[PDB]
């Protein structure tokens, strides 16, 4: 993450991020709504950050420092470039929506009134097709990645030393290779929980309640499609085991 965005999302909530004189000017319902929108953006910022650790720290460090067999790094980090592209663009739109809403003379005071439309766009059309295809591929390669990691860590000394070196800093405590893979797989199922709670506090403007209800439906259709498109790949699985599923 970049320092500007980390400081903007350093507080535990929107109510602690904005100035108290700005907070005092809003109704409790607006504060409740904003606290959940802030959590959605803050967790999207952390999710893009998990994808940067996977591409820049792990993937690139392995290509530049290790001598692994071709197609091994791809098996450890499937679809990471596509995932980073999808989520970096989504994060850009969320961060620009907050930025446009800042009061003049402030870098922290804002209210987002129109999130629904942005969520309908992300979870419909070509971008939704790309999210569906990418997560169906990623989640089907999830087990294979964990087994390949475990194999390399057990048999390669230089791979063990590389992992121990790059994951030693305290800021990487929750972000080992296997933890990053599960963080990414679990991301998509966090969306309906966040959107449902935002919707619970967005009844004031009927157009907004409607757009969030449509976005919630679109996310659920996407998850249902991803869940139905999963079949775990296994290294060395024979055709007979596959067609006898």
């Amino acid at each position: 993450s970049m320092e500007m965005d980390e400081k903007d999302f350093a507080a535990d909530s929107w109510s602690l991020a904005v100035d108290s004189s700005f907070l005092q000017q809003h109704k409790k319902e607006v504060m409740k709504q904003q606290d959940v929108i802030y959590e959605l953006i803050q967790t999207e910022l952390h999710h893009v950050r998990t994808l940067k650790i996977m591409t820049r720290l792990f993937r690139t460090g392995m290509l530049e420092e290790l001598h692994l067999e071709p197609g091994v790094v791809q098996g450890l980090f499937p679809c990471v470039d596509e995932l980073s592209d999808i989520h970096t663009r989504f994060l850009s739109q969320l961060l620009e929506r907050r930025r446009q809403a800042l009061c003049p003379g402030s870098t922290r005071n804002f209210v987002i009134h129109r999130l629904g439309d942005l969520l309908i766009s992300q979870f419909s059309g070509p971008s939704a097709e790309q999210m569906c295809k990418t997560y169906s591929e990623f989640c089907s390669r999830h087990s294979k990645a964990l087994k390949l990691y475990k194999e390399l860590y057990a048999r390669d000394k230089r791979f063990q030393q590389f992992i121990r070196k790059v994951t030693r800093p305290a800021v990487l405590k929750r972000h080992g290779v296997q933890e990053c893979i599960l963080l990414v797989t679990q991301r998509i199922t966090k969306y309906p929980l966040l959107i449902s709670r935002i919707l619970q506090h967005s009844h004031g403007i009927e157009e907004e309640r409607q757009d969030l209800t449509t976005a919630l439906g679109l996310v659920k259709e996407l998850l249902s499609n991803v869940d139905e498109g999963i079949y775990q790949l296994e290294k060395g699985a024979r055709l007979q085991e596959i067609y006898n599923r």
Binding site: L16, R174, L182, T189, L194, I230
Partner: protein
Amino acid sequence: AIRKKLVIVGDGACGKTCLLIVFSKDQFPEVYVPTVFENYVADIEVDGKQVELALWDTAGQEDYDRLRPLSYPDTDVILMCFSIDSPDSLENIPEKWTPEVKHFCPNVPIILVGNKKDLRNDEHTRRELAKMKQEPVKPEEGRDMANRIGAFGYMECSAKTKDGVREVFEMATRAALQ
């Protein structure tokens, strides 16, 4: 420290997310309770042994039968939750959650946990349940279900008051060490 992995399972309204948040957070969430939990690596010292216990939630995965099992690989201990204000969350334990966890996590200890124990003496909770010919889950009902499903043990806690939370995670660490 040795690395161990914990996964909490249970119905949508069982209070699993709140339990993980209260344990992980240094200060209680008095201003905002988070909707979701990402992950956490707890530093725990139990009976003289230092463990790094990684914590994971399955909230959001309850309706996705092919996505949910991806949370299970290499789990060392399962916390199987139900809510004490929801006798219906207890009835789903033996024929829904238990066979799934036994299939994907063979030989992994399961601790059955009764959450929201503070609602056992809450009048609003007792009045609402009484309208559906129900009452809060009794301590013996929890123990009997834990005995029946082959659980390592039965424990109760309140994420709201923090009572029993530390003991649950310290016992989970001991189970993971066996």
